[PDB]
């Protein structure tokens, strides 16, 4: 049985996701329009910036992340944001389309659109495989949500200070994820290992993205298209 | 008579304007769409950033501004950019509409749209009067162009280093503007003083804008909507 606190942790983490995820994608109509050189970098940088904002609102509703010192909350978001975006993007991603489908065809980002935002296939190959490998895992929303809060609260991120407190949080979440898949996911004796594997998958997608981010940001004619928030979160600040 | 060099200075300054001014306003369809809180700050900040880019391309084609040290070229653009935008915006402005008309009604910025980008009527009152006072001056394109290069090359701008060289440029331009209105503008015995008055008008519109800019930029929830280039040019850097 799931305890009373671990069930509130589930209810509260799902609430957080439902507040910061818009299944209508209606706020997309206010990004810089896409183009299909880097015709897609402005609309896509807007999408990343939009996402970063939603990731911060998720994190602030995670139990006890609000309680962590502001330095810790920055360092966690600074190093985990791109993983949590890649993680949340699965919701729009479609196995059939092999593309994130965010409304109409104007927000159907296939693989070509992404190469036209400065990113090479060395990031795009592992990312599409991540998306379908996570998709095919047919996760319950209570596991997708939980996995996100777990990737966030990792102490093994550069420049965190109270390892023992954010580890105390993440473990408590890992406990909730494992008991959920046992008690609640019919067939998931293998699943919690599958999910924890996606976490290691992420960190390697993070490495490639943040390496290809340096390529774009060292070109001022490209960094010109980014947004104040992107430049702040993916910047190398301390 | 206009000399051979002063006529090339006119031909070259007009060329510069014709390269950096798009009378179709077609690149507007790629700004963040307008909304009519600050519903207009994203589209309008995009317009200002777009403009700053066109102002830099104008300046680089002004004779001998290219020759000035990069520090001087930065300091001139840093303090003159908003005046040269306000100056160039007259081209789209309409006495009849009392609004800049940049294509369809989607790019018809009346006075309400501008208050919805963070700016108060203390900037909007003097600016609309500037626009119609400059408009009614029915300037020749060779004077509108010349006045822009003159407002740029002012040595009395904060942090310029070679006053005597950029003064040498601006005078040479003032000489060309005066001889143009005498030899070429039928009725402009009063006009060169009218134009030089708009310059003093500008500096006072500059003061109000850059004061109201500090209000917006000290609010990170608003500065979030600006662009890397805006923040760089209107920033207080040295």
């Amino acid at each position: 049985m799931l305890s009373d606190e671990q069930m509130q942790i589930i209810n509260s983490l799902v609430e957080a996701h439902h507040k910061t995820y818009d299944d209508s994608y209606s706020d997309f109509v206010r990004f810089r329009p896409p183009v299909r050189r880097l015709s897609m970098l402005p609309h896509l940088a807007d999408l990343v910036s939009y996402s970063i904002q939603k990731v911060i609102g998720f994190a602030k509703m995670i139990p006890g992340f609000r309680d962590l010192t502001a330095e810790d909350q920055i360092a966690l978001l600074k190093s985990s944001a791109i993983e949590i975006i890649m993680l949340r993007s699965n919701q729009s991603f479609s196995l059939e389309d092999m593309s994130w489908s965010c409304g109409g065809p104007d927000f159907k980002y296939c693989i070509n659109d992404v190469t036209k935002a400065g990113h090479t296939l060395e990031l795009l190959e592992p990312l599409v495989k991540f998306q379908v490998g996570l998709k095919k895992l047919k996760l319950h929303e209570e596991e997708h949500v939980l996995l996100m809060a777990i990737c966030l609260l990792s102490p093994d991120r550069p420049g965190v200070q109270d390892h023992v407190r954010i580890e105390a949080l993440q473990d408590r979440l890992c406990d909730v994820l494992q008991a959920y898949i046992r008690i609640q996911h019919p067939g998931g004796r293998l699943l919690y290992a599958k999910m924890i594997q996606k976490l290691a998958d992420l960190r390697s997608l993070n490495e490639e993205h943040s390496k290809q981010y340096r390529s774009l940001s060292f070109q001022p004619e490209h960094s010109m298209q980014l947004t104040p928030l992107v430049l702040e979160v993916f910047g190398s600040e301390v | 008579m206009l000399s051979d060099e002063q006529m090339q200075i006119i031909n070259s300054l007009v060329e510069a304007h014709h390269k950096t001014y798009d009378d179709s306003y077609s690149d507007f369809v790629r700004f963040r769409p307008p909304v009519r809180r600050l519903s207009m700050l994203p589209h309008l900040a995009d317009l200002v950033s777009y403009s700053i880019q066109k102002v830099i391309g104008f300046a680089k084609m002004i004779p001998g501004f290219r020759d000035l040290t990069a520090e001087d070229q930065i300091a001139l653009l840093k303090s003159s950019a908003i005046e040269i935008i306000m100056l160039r915006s007259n081209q789209s402005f309409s006495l009849e509409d009392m609004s800049w008309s940049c294509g369809g009604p989607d790019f018809k910025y009346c006075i309400n749209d501008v208050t919805k980008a963070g700016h108060t009527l203390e900037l909007l009152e003097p600016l609309v009067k500037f626009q119609v006072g400059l408009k009614k001056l029915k300037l020749h394109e060779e004077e509108h162009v010349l006045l822009m290069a003159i407002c740029l090359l002012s040595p009395d701008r904060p942090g310029v280093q070679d006053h005597v060289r950029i003064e040498a440029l601006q005078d040479r331009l003032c000489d060309v503007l005066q001889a143009y209105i005498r030899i070429q503008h039928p009725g402009g015995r009063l006009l060169y003083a009218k134009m030089i008055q708009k310059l003093a008008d500008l500096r006072s519109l500059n003061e109000e804008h850059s004061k109201q800019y500090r209000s917006l930029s000290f609010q990170p929830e608003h500065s979030m909507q600006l662009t890397p280039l805006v923040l760089e040019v209107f920033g207080s850097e040295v």
């Binding site: 602030k60 502001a70 920055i74 978001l77 702040e232 600040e237 | 990170p220 929830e221 500065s223």
Partner: peptide
Amino acid sequence: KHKILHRLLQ
């Protein structure tokens, strides 16, 4: 510091 991050986090 991280102005916008500080702001968004309250």
